Design a protein around this ligand. Structure first.
Ligand SMILES: [Ca+2]
Ligand SMILES: [Mg+2]
Ligand SMILES: [Mg+2]
Length: 429
DNA sequence: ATTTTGACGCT
DNA sequence: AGCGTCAAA
């Protein structure tokens, strides 16, 4: 009752760019705008692998991971843009730079946590308080929320936009605008701010995005996906029981893999809401102390993970796969590709040092051997003392050379199916 | 023969 | 330290 926390103490948003790499390419090439199109890496093998897909193309069934040749069977007029290749490998610089554009705009509004190349969490609690003080009891107009959905509404006693407006009207009609401590009002002001933030992103970059607004990161992330693209969704604390009552467990962030499968298998449930019937101790007994407490609160819509103040990636990495017959089988091959990776890494590190006043101090080398299901077969670290590609490639070879079983120095066995260099452990400079 | 990435947890 | 999990385009 009066002491039961309800996880309504924060306003958190998650902003996620729509079909991000596709929008980057469509901004650059107006011929691709408003078309079924996809972004692909490589082209020799089956037309290249698709990594991003416009919503027009998704209507034909085109998805990520599809070979372009196969996507063309579903969508013969599909347009394609290719990821840049440099030093023999795909190079994602254009998308990293577009990401910086968006992150820098979002940072003007509030502290953000960079969650991926195209998404960030926003802690809006303080901004909401400020805006509520500015508003001075003034009601919030639907015109301030032109792309907002209120999850769960409309309810009670045939076009998409009509339903959105009906739900928003029910919500705003029911709000108590004089209570500055009302969580629902705080979320609503949050959504007003997010409309402003999304408008700024689109104005200043050309890119559209979706967003979720709720009381914590997990619900904000879930909310964001409910009405893509180019829309935002408010998930209130009160919407949680109905929302979770038919929500597959795997849809909640962190439960899409083995742990989620085990929750389903061990407990014999399917939906997030069903978790409420277990005690905290029961959940801890199956999934561990940390996961158990997290599940117990999360299934009630409560999560405390903070929006971390971090706009920049914590690592800078470069990797290449060598699938099937292309696996690296000679020492020379391994050294040449380590050099290519190290040259890209050097370029990115030097730019990072100039832009962000920091230097990486550890180099992580990872390889995969043909026959291993795991992404990485072996990982070794060494000191990163100079931004020099020849030194980094030599040091990586030094730390992995003993993995070569082959009695012949010139041959590498078992062949390598992946090389990965990652700069970590940044210090101020 | 998806590939190329991050962030963080466990021991 | 080195390995595993989960998530992005
Ligand atoms: Ca996205
Ligand atoms: Mg994303
Ligand atoms: Mg996606």
């Amino acid at each position: 009752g009066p002491h039961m926390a309800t996880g309504q103490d924060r306003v958190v948003a998650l902003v996620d760019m729509d079909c991000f790499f596709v929008q980057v390419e469509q901004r650059q090439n107006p011929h691709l705008r408003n078309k079924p199109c996809a972004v692909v890496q490589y082209k020799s093998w089956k037309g290249g692998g698709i990594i991003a897909v416009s919503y027009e193309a998704r209507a034909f069934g085109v998805t990520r991971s599809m070979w372009a040749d196969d996507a063309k069977k579903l969508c013969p007029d599909l347009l394609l843009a290719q990821v840049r290749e440099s030093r023999g490998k795909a190079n994602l610089t254009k998308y990293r730079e577009a990401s910086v554009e968006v992150m820098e705009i979002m940072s003007r509004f509030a502290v953000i946590e960079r969650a991926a190349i195209d998404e960030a969490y926003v802690d809006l609690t303080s901004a909401v308080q400020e805006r509520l003080q500015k508003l001075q009891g003034q009601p919030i107009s639907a015109d301030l929320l032109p792309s907002t959905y209120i999850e769960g509404l409309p309810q009670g006693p045939v076009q998409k936009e009509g339903m959105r407006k009906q739900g928003l009207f029910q919500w705003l009609d029911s709000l108590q605008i004089d209570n500055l401590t009302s969580p629902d009002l705080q979320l609503t002001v949050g959504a007003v701010i997010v409309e402003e933030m999304r408008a700024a992103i689109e104005r200043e970059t050309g890119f559209q995005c979706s967003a979720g607004i709720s009381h914590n990161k997990v619900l904000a992330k879930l909310a964001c996906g409910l009405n893509k693209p180019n829309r935002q969704t408010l998930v209130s604390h009160g919407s949680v029981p109905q929302l979770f009552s038919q929500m597959p467990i795997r849809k909640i962030r962190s439960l899409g893999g083995k742990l989620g499968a085990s929750v389903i298998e061990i407990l014999g449930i399917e939906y997030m809401g069903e978790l409420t019937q277990f005690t905290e101790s029961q959940l801890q007994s199956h999934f561990g102390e940390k996961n158990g407490s997290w599940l117990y609160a999360m299934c009630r819509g409560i999560e405390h993970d903070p929006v971390k103040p971090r706009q920049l990636p914590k690592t800078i990495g470069c990797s290449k796969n060598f699938p099937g017959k292309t696996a690296l089988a000679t020492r020379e091959q391994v050294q040449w590709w380590l050099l290519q990776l190290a040259q890209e890494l050097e370029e990115r590190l030097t730019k990072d040092r100039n832009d962000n006043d920091r230097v990486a101090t550890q180099l992580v080398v990872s390889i995969r051997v043909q026959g291993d299901k795991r992404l990485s077969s072996l990982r070794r670290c060494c000191a990163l003392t100079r931004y020099d590609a020849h030194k980094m490639s030599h040091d990586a070879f030094t730390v992995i050379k003993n993995c070569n079983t082959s009695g012949i120095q010139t041959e590498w066995s078992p062949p390598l199916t992946m090389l990965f260099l990652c700069a970590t452990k940044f210090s101020a400079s």
